[PDB]
Amino acid sequence: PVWSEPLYSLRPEHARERLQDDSVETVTSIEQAKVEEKIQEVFSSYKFNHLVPRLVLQREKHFHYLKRGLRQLTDAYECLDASRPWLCYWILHSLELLDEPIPQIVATDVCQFLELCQSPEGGFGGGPGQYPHLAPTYAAVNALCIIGTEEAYDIINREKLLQYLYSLKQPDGSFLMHVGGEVDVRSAYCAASVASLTNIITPDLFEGTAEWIARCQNWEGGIGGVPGMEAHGGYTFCGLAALVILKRERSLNLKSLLQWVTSRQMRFEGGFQGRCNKLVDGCYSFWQAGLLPLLHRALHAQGDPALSMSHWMFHQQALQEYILMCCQCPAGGLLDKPGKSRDFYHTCYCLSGLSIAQHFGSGAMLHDVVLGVPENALQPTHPVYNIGPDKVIQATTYFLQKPVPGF
């Protein structure tokens, strides 16, 4: 019947997926067991014997939470005073995913604010008068593209932005996060993302970058912040996404990467962990699961005859079950895991991940899997930039009509 929908996480065999600690306890297994015990309780609260009501994404609650945060915030957000463009991006992207229109007045106000965050040396800082930094620069550019008006597009000082990127480029192909700052894979992604969207890529800008990123892939198959470091979903997403933009995916061992990321989905919780033997977390619904559409495209470009034409290579239903049942705050907003407090970062990435899990697309093939009530369907998101695909095409088309600064 349409009013009952069996869930993967509620199958009787699912209990067999509980952690097996081999009777050898360590801090790792103890923490993992604690999370699993809590998640089972949540899972059980959605089952009424053979009656299993369709899952519901609390759209309206999330919408009101987001709308409020776009204007004001309590001093509890003082810790993010150097990341305000991020707040703009997370909120605007969440509203975009929820197909909630952004009032023209709000759009113009965001544009004006981001203009105040833009540095005369190029790039954007975390707030008015702050030094530019690749993280908020990435967020600001994405936010402006989500608004997608010529007003928004023109705020970006493309000439100075390119010079700024040059001012951060290292001889080994890596980029500093900011002047006198540190280097890790996030910088390469932030730079490639904003440079490709605004059409300011030069032949030497990313010279050596692809090779440097490949050195960050480790024995695990995933990618670490810098060569030698442990593989993490955050850095792995940045690394592969950057290579996709540079069309150098083949610089990596795509086989070891594929096996690594698919292994990061938790057999019991259904969500993804950030690194082997650590905990499940709703935001990895994007950072990790987002790697599959990227890998799909990369393998497809190579002519892989075994690729699916209907599903991503991860359990799409299980991820949707984890997000919908365990990552929604009753009062609106989403989060890491049950027991944690809501925040705009997790709201953005949990929703971004839910969208990826619902929509498969390759070539002329489209196959949707919207778990729960049909209204749960979110707008699609681009796996590389994490803003609507429509927004990507519109921005790239616009900026492609302008020349690369100083050629």
Binding site: L19, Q20, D22, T26, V27, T28, S29, G69, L70, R71, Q72, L73, T74, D75, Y77, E78, C79, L80, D81, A82, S83, R84, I91, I105, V106, D109, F113, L116, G125, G126, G127, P128, G129, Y131, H133, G180, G181, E182, W219, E220, G224, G228, M229, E230, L258, Q259, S263, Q265, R267, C276, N277, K278, D304, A306, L307, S308, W312, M313, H315, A318
Partner: protein
């Protein structure tokens, strides 16, 4: 001098030694967005920070001010940058700053700016004498702190301090054999010292890992490390490993063991192994078993592997 929480703390707008300079308010525009309702103390400090920055005042008072700005928001990279400019301009005692960063990191170990600041200081001083012990203390509180491990690798590599790291790795693995950050460090140390080409070293590592697997069969890190040190040469290049794993099959079984077998078979088929049809059939049966029963969360992956094997062999 005085901390932000000290009973005698005084707002900068009330300090006589700061009366000569006008504070610079943050301009968020006429119709603000993502506007943070700052506490009075927070805004006070940043209004004066903006003043010194805009004035590019390289002074002792500005230096002390950055300390308060940092306490209010240790993630403000602009403040940290200016503090470093001041350390140089004022020729501040760097060992004193090291004691400062030490306390700060202990309080906020999951912050990018504090670890970068410490690295800059160690670089300026070319003095790594306190690093391994300090990092060890942080890791004693959180054995997986990503920044801590990254800083540890940098220090060891930059100053060639490899001598006792494998011993450190073994101790942490004893404490928690499931600590993936430690297995990563293990590879880091060996690959940069002896390397894995020395067959005696490789044998030692394969033996070590297999013993850990027998002890904790469902610990994924050990399995991943085993594959990690053998994958480049090719899993099919180690014939005895297949048999030993095949023997543990009936008992110490698990999705990790079954998956490893598929990986071995894949490499075998990719290397013109003998009895190809038989190997392919075994591999396909295991992919099915994994997809339908033992590792269903990865059903799509295993189905893909099954199809890949058929398209290739």
């Amino acid at each position: 001098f005085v901390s932000l929480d000290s009973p005698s703390y005084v707002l900068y707008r009330d300090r006589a030694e700061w009366a000569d300079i006008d504070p610079v308010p943050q301009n968020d525009g006429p119709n603000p967005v993502v506007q943070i309702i700052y506490s009075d103390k927070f805004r006070d400090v940043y209004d004066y920070f903006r003043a010194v920055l805009q004035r590019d005042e390289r002074s002792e008072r500005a230096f002390k001010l950055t300390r308060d700005a940092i306490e209010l928001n240790a993630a403000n990279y602009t403040v940290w940058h200016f503090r470093r400019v001041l350390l140089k301009s004022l020729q501040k005692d760097l060992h004193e700053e090291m004691n400062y960063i030490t306390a700060i990191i202990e309080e906020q170990p999951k912050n990018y700016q504090v670890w970068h600041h410490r690295r800059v200081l160690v670089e300026w001083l070319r003095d790594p004498s306190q690093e391994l012990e300090f990092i060890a203390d942080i890791l004693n509180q959180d054995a997986k702190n990503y920044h801590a491990w990254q800083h540890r690798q940098w220090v060891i590599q930059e100053f060639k301090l490899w001598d006792n790291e494998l011993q450190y790795v073994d101790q942490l693995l004893k404490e928690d054999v499931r600590n993936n950050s430690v297995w990563n460090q293990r590879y880091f140390v060996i690959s940069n010292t002896t390397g894995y080409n020395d067959r005696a070293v490789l044998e030692r590592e394969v033996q070590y890992t297999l013993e850990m697997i027998k002890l904790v069969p469902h610990n994924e890190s050990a399995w991943n490390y085993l594959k990690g040190i053998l994958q480049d040469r090719g899993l099919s290049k180690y014939p005895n490993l297949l048999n030993q794993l095949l023997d543990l099959q009936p008992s110490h079984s698990s999705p990790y063991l079954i998956a490893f077998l598929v990986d071995i078979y894949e490499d075998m088929l990719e290397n013109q192994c003998d009895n190809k049809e038989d190997i392919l059939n075994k591999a396909l049966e295991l992919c099915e078993i994994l997809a339908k029963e033992k590792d269903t969360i990865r059903k799509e992956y295993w189905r893909y592997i099954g199809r890949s094997l058929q398209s290739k062999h």
